[PDB]
Paper text:
We also included a previously identified straight filament mutant, HagA233V, in the study. Another example is the R-type mutant [name] in [name]. In the [name] mutant, valine in subunit S0 makes stronger contacts than an alanine residue with the hydrophobic pockets formed by A43, L46 and A47 in subunit S+11, and [name] filaments adopt a right-handed form.
There are three parts to the flagellar structure: the trans-membrane basal body that functions as the motor, the connecting rod and hook, and the flagellar filament that acts like a helical propeller. Our current understanding of supercoiling in bacterial flagellar filaments, referred to as polymorphic switching, is based upon the notion that protofilaments within the flagellar filament can exist in two discrete states, that differ slightly in length. The “short” state results from a protofilament having a right-handed inclination (the R-state), while the “long” state results from a protofilament having a left-handed inclination (the L-state). To reconstruct filaments at high resolution, all protofilaments must be “locked” into the same state, either L- or R-type, producing straightened filaments that lead to non-motile bacteria.
Author numbering:
A (entry chain A), B (entry chain L), C (entry chain B): 255 to 304
D (entry chain A), E (entry chain L), F (entry chain K): 3 to 51
G (entry chain V): 52 to 254
H (entry chain f): 52 to 152
I (entry chain r): 204 to 254
J (entry chain r): 103 to 152
Amino acid sequence: NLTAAESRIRDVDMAKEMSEFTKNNILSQASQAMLAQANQQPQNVLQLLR
Amino acid sequence: NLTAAESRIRDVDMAKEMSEFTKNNILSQASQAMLAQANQQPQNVLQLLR
Amino acid sequence: NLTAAESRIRDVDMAKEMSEFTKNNILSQASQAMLAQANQQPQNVLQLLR
Amino acid sequence: INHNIAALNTLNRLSSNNSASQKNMEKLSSGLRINRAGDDAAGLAISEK
Amino acid sequence: INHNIAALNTLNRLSSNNSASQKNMEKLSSGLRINRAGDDAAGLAISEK
Amino acid sequence: INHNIAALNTLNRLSSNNSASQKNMEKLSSGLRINRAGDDAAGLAISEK
Amino acid sequence: MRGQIRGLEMASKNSQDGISLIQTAEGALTETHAILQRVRELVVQAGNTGTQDKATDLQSIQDEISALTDEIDGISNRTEFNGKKLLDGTYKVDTATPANQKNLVFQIGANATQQISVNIEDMGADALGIKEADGSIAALHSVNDLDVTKFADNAADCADIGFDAQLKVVDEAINQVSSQRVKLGAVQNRLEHTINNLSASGE
Amino acid sequence: MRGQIRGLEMASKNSQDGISLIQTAEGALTETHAILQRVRELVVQAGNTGTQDKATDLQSIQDEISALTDEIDGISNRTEFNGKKLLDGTYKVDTATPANQ
Amino acid sequence: DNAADCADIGFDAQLKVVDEAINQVSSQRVKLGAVQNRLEHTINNLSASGE
Amino acid sequence: QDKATDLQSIQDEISALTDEIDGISNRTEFNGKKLLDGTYKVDTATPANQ
């Protein structure tokens, strides 16, 4: 019983934590794409200049 | 922990530094355009002369 | 024991050394991109000329 | 409109998600949600007893 | 009104932004904000220890 | 964000689990939890007597 | 503006480094904790052996335990974060004079008063105490772990030797280090919430 | 005309900056909120432990919680937008005298 | 030696006086900016007057 | 967090920077004229010497 409760404190649910991981890594790639889009506007400011 | 702190001293945020780079290169092109406009007035001084 | 110490002298940590490799190859591609950006300014110097 | 990217929250979201992912792997590799004490001090002290 | 371009600050802004961009790439290629000691002597000495 | 993998604990977890597994097999092949004295010096000295 | 912003960025940097410090400290406390668990095991075994095995086996057990205590103080001494002692009495909770606490003020924000201090205290003598430890009990329960030949004398009767006493004070030492680790975990949480507030503020 | 126009532009500027202020405030309240959620968790656990675990585990729980409260007031004090306290009682809803609000 | 206690060493004291030095140079720059404005309005008045 | 020697490094930097402050206040000249030093102080003891 004690080791079971220990586990319920400590035991990772690798399923949950890998869904969460997959998610978060994808959020990294996501936000990186958002920068890749964000930085594309000032060039059109140059087009305003010329 | 130590290598983490090292990194927080040394580690470039390539995202930040590329937004900054993209910016600054564009500021170069910007100011160059500003010269390309600046140098166009003396010819109209010639038009004053003739 | 002796062969263990030998290993601790000689044994590559392929994990560490592949993280390091992956890193360094990416730094190659990185700096190459930096040249690919660096060489794009003199053309705008031509735009200053004309 | 250019001298400062407005997309600055996006950077801290990037740092957040990267750090998150790091901690995720820390748990996944260790097999412990309580691997470091910063996780849950309460469940830590419990697990100690 | 012509014998000296008034747009002279613009030149030093050009030199500034070019030098800036150079240093940026220096960091981007090295992966070090502290690549040269002129960057941050304090964080340098720290990183040395 | 790249010049040093944040996943460094993961490496020492890898070394830890590998060394662990090694010691496990050491016990499994020998049939002794006390195979080497580093295991349990107390139970060793007992088992000696 | 730029003043507050730059100092803010440095404040978050400062914060992450403070985190790293307390992670080092708590890792030292993780191994501290591991040893104390092992000591507890050895006390349990010691308690059975007090009327099963002999004074020499107990002598072996205390060779182990006393070596482990030497490792406790060894951790409290060797553990350093960029050279700085973390665990020794140098950052004690409460001296006789509160001025001498020398508390671990870290920079937290970008302006005056935006600071937090903490305390750390571990060593060999981490057994019971009212402000300090005490003599035969409450210090040497961790420094000595008395059962050399002394649980061959009695069961728990003496109340300073006695197995109930030894063991409960070991468990309390576990609680001391416990609560300390609990502190630093909370501290880490505080700095995480901090860096969030900082990052949003800086935006 | 030019009076109203220039002051209008400055009014929109003023407005965006007021926005930024309340965004800082609400970010501090986001972390405030996060902590209070965590406190709620600790109270739920505390409620089970009230007849499962002991006074010392509860003591640990309240070491955590009381530390977190210290962080609550820490947020209410440290949170500033260009130096200005935002969360403390200085901008209370209703004093005894409404003049002092 | 201390956190901010000494009030002459103390970190609060050091930092606030640094910030005040920033305010000294600030106000000075503010002066000269105003001065520039004054001379611009001046040269306008002058040019019109001279016309 | 860090030691007296790191602080010593920090103050090597800062004190050097202060030396640069007075260096600016001395070197800065507009057609030879000192601008920043105490020569054009706000208020001496005697207002005549301003």
